Amino acid sequence: GMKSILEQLSSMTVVVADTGDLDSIKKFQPRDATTNPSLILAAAKNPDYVKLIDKAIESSENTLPNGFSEIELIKETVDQVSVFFGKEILKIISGRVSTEVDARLSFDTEATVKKARKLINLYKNFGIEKERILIKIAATWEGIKAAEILEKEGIKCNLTLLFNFCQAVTCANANITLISPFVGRILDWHKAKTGKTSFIGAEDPGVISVTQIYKYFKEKGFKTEVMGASFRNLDEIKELAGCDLLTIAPKFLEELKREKGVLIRKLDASTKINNSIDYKFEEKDFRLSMLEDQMASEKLSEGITGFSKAIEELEELLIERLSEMKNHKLISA
Ligand SMILES: [Cl-]
Ligand SMILES: [Cl-]
Ligand SMILES: [Cl-]
Ligand code: NA
Ligand code: NA
Ligand code: NA
Ligand code: NA
Ligand code: NA
Ligand code: NA
């Protein structure tokens, strides 16, 4: 001591800087980070990292059967470039890289499982073992089912677009490695629905939900890690002090380090042995509970759409790079 709020928090929670690009990963050195379409779009703007994009195109060209089409090339490249960038992240960070599974497959268990397997085998081909990877999947019924299958073969999953207790419990019962609820998106939905201008501290509906999920998971002895993410304000983070992980904007990290005073570990549950109900949500109950939760079903649907938009934009960028690559060869001696 004296102990900053950040130092207190770090004694209770694995704190990870929220990063969306490689420069920020290098700067902040987060324990965990993510390869996804948006990070790669960001990198395309960088004269260093864009070369790694062109390399994925070249590698995909080498990989495919003779006579491949441009469509087949772009598809294969989307896979390879995601892995190239994940390997680049693993050279910087000490922990795990979340690897986004194409969100367009979010309602297809078999396709999600097959894509995860493909990405894991690509990582293996490039010298990276599966324990360094989290396969990141939207928490639809089908995505959780795919993760259930994957976990059984030792492929660790991060279940994201996770908004309610129903989704959390379904993941826990399926032995999912990690869930990443987006707290600030839950807050946003309630403000947007009601015109309430704020939900302060413990009243924040995202904080309420993640608090409940954490308490249940620990009391029941579930192994699934809870990573609170996507924060709108610093009070949300403080309310969830003691969560397994919290992904936090660099500016909030700096502010917590500046602050003094007392931070209470609110998320402090441990295993209990008692007669409380063990909740289960089989497919029908899951679907009905989701239907009744307008917040979770809309934020899940919008999130999937947003992920799908960014992967479509990636595909468009790869088409551009291919064109540029061809032009450069034709005009060079
Ligand atoms: Cl669903
Ligand atoms: Cl506002
Ligand atoms: Cl050339
Ligand atoms: Na191939
Ligand atoms: Na992909
Ligand atoms: Na696809
Ligand atoms: Na408080
Ligand atoms: Na913790
Ligand atoms: Na995306």
Residue 108 sits in a domain whose CATH number is 3.20.20.70
Q: How far does the centroid of ligand 4 lie from the alpha carbon of residue 314, in Å?
A: 20
Structural domain containing residue 99 = 1-333
Residue whose pair of structure tokens reads 């949300």 in the numeric block: 236
Q: Are strands 245-248 and 225-228 parallel, antiparallel or unpaired?
A: parallel
10, 58, 298 from 140: Cα distances, Å: 32, 34, 12
Q: How far does the centroid of ligand 6 lie from the alpha carbon of residue 142, in Å?
A: 15
Cβ-contact 295, 50 below 8 angstroms: no
Tally of domains within the chain? 1
Broken C–N links (> 2.5 Å) in the chain, after residues: none
Say what the resolution is, in angstroms: 1.9
Which structure tokens are listed for 119?
A: 């990405």
Ligand located closest to 162 CA: 1
| Distance separating alpha carbons of residues 290 and 284, to the nearest angstrom | 10
CA–CA–CA angle 300, 306, 307 (5° rounding): 90
| Distance separating alpha carbons of residues 84 and 35, to the nearest angstrom | 9
| Distance separating alpha carbons of residues 95 and 226, to the nearest angstrom | 16
Which listed residue (136, 218, 266, 299) is catalytic? 136
Q: Is 145 a catalytic residue?
A: no
Instruction: Give the count of alpha carbons within 13 A of 77, CB side only.
Output: 28
| Distance separating alpha carbons of residues 132 and 116, to the nearest angstrom | 14
Residue 102 CB neighbour total at 10 angstroms: 21
Helix (H, G, I), strand (E, B) or coil at 29: coil
Q: How far does the centroid of ligand 5 lie from the alpha carbon of residue 173, in Å?
A: 27
| Distance separating alpha carbons of residues 328 and 333, to the nearest angstrom | 10
Ligand located closest to 190 CA: 2
3-state helix, strand, coil in the chain (%, to 5): 60, 10, 30
Helix (H, G, I), strand (E, B) or coil at 249: coil
Instruction: Give the count of alpha carbons within 13 A of 234, CB side only.
Output: 14
What's the burial of 28, exposed, middle or buried (CB within 10 Å: 0-12/13-18/19+)? middle
Cβ-contact 211, 268 below 8 angstroms: no
Q: How far does the centroid of ligand 3 lie from the alpha carbon of residue 333, in Å?
A: 8
Strand arrangement of the beta sheet that strand 97-100 belongs to: 14-17, 245-248, 225-228, 178-180, 157-160, 133-138, 97-100, 33-35
Residues around ligand 5, an ion, CB closer than 5 A: 78-79, 102
Helix (H, G, I), strand (E, B) or coil at 58: helix
